[PDB]
Scaffold this active site. Structure first.
Site: not given
Lengths: 312, 312
Positions: B11, B13, B16, B44, B137
């Protein structure tokens, strides 16, 4: 003594230079593939020049140039990779390109990967993050055997100038410390400690042997199967001083570690697989493996007494 | 859209943050999971307290701790991972630990992973090393699926500020040049360039809607399927003036890519695959799968005309 043609890739590195001078001193025509990182690295270059004024041949090549790699490999019999650095990820998996280049050519009689440690498929049931090293090296191992290359996995354990230098301390100093020493638990759990030159000497002696063919080569020198506390004890016996012992254990030390971020919890939980779960000596050798010191009884191994007999 | 409690992993990035705003804006009890980024960053932490201020509730918990995770997750109903870093692709295989907690606590009605780019299931044929993104992924997607975890895979193509804002250049300078530019190939090949805040919206309007359950949502905005020469015209031939142009070839420009560092070879393999192989638009989307723009009429997406007039 012998004529075999070795190519060392990774050979400006820490164990690589040991493998490299072993080649040259045990009679091998040695070639050293080096990258481009002559760029500002006078250090790497002067060692290559040093390697070269001993009789080595230098191959300018990169790993990405597949066709020069195969050209290069056709000139030699054995190829030894000592390719390693940081996270033990970015540079261990480069060796796949070198396996692809070995499969294509056909004249390699032996390939020895960038091992020289714990032995990846001996469970490594290991605590994360530093579980990656053993993951990486397996991809490389399972791809060698797929393409049926002739291998010897040189699982050689702890280099004495990395763990007996420091006495295995969490601070990274490469010297045995006065006053304290942190011990892991009991410090009775056995470890194996090897001079960086005994590791090079034993890998150039595996090189052409029928016996080390597709087998894992453990260096387990009888005298150096020592616990943590017993290597602290050779220092004590040598420096003539008794340190002030503390001792530490598994649980919140492992969650501590799991919160001190990567490279710091990779070295911890490795150091925690060495001196807690005991992955250096807690197993069998038996059928698809050998011991380096049994095979080459004539070779000269340095004890941690004689290795520490210079750290003071 | 509306009151499902979303947990947001990754959340702080680049994309994010964007999904957090949207979460809040579209009426969801936003629950932001955060590692120790406390440890490191000021911005951050200030970003998190901004969320906190705006409506969100903070959960600090690593991905290494199953207790905190399972229990942190039992509060919510939708997890949304936006686990960044390209060098931090270990953070894709981080979502393996998380999925083993998304199932271990059940409860979640829709998990959508760290996607937001190219569809890796478009059985990427992708160049080595950038495919070593789609591998990680594709490992998660199969893990969500066998584990019978519900989902929605958001494939959203190029984040505009990182592609239109760069004019997909390669010197790294995240603003559009005033003087020189490199056109890939001939530069006629297609890309879909979406705005980061519509990525967030279209993502959030997709979490509780019976058409996106267990499918791949693509975001293919009509006014934004453009090529590089075409977003370069927009830059100059409307908004600035004119760039001296240069075309790079598929060939020894794949070799250009060849001698660089592992994380540079990846971006190049991903560039050198949108602009060259055409992979954002050389395919057949459908017929059970869906598209964001079509599905969500109400949102007035942002054009590459509107986005670059912000760069003037």
């Amino acid at each position: 003594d012998k004529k075999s043609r070795v190519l060392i890739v990774g050979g400006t590195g820490y164990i690589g230079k040991r493998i490299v001078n072993a080649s040259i001193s045990l009679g091998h025509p040695t070639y050293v593939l080096f990258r481009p990182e002559v760029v500002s690295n006078i250090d790497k270059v002067q060692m290559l020049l040093y390697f070269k004024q001993l009789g080595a041949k230098l191959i300018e090549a990169s790993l990405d140039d597949h066709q020069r790699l195969v050209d290069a490999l056709k000139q030699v019999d054995v190829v030894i990779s000592a390719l390693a650095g940081g996270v033990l990820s970015h540079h261990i998996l480069e060796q796949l390109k070198l396996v692809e280049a070995i499969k294509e050519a056909g004249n390699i009689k032996r390939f020895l990967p960038s091992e020289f440690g714990m032995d990846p498929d001996i469970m490594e049931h290991a605590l994360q993050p530093g579980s990656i090293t053993f993951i990486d090296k397996r991809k490389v191992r399972r791809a060698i055997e797929a393409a049926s290359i002739p291998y010897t996995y040189v699982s050689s354990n702890m280099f004495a100038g990395y763990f007996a230098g420091s006495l295995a301390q969490l601070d990274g100093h490469m010297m045995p410390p006065r006053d304290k020493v942190l011990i892991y638990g009991d410090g009775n759990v056995k470890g194996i400690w090897v001079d960086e030159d005994d590791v090079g000497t034993y890998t150039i002696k595996s090189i052409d042997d029928p016996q080390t063919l597709n087998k894992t080569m453990y260096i387990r020198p009888p005298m150096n199967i020592l616990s943590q506390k017993e290597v602290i004890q050779i220092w004590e016996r040598l420096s003539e001083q008794n340190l002030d012992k503390i001792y530490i254990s598994s649980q919140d030390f492992l969650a501590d570690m799991k919160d001190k971020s990567y490279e710091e919890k990779i070295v911890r939980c490795h150091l925690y697989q060495i001196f807690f779960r005991g992955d250096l000596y807690n197993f069998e050798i038996g059928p698809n493996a050998i011991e380096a010191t049994k095979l080459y009884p004539e070779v000269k191994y340095v004890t941690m007494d004689s290795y520490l007999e210079r750290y003071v």
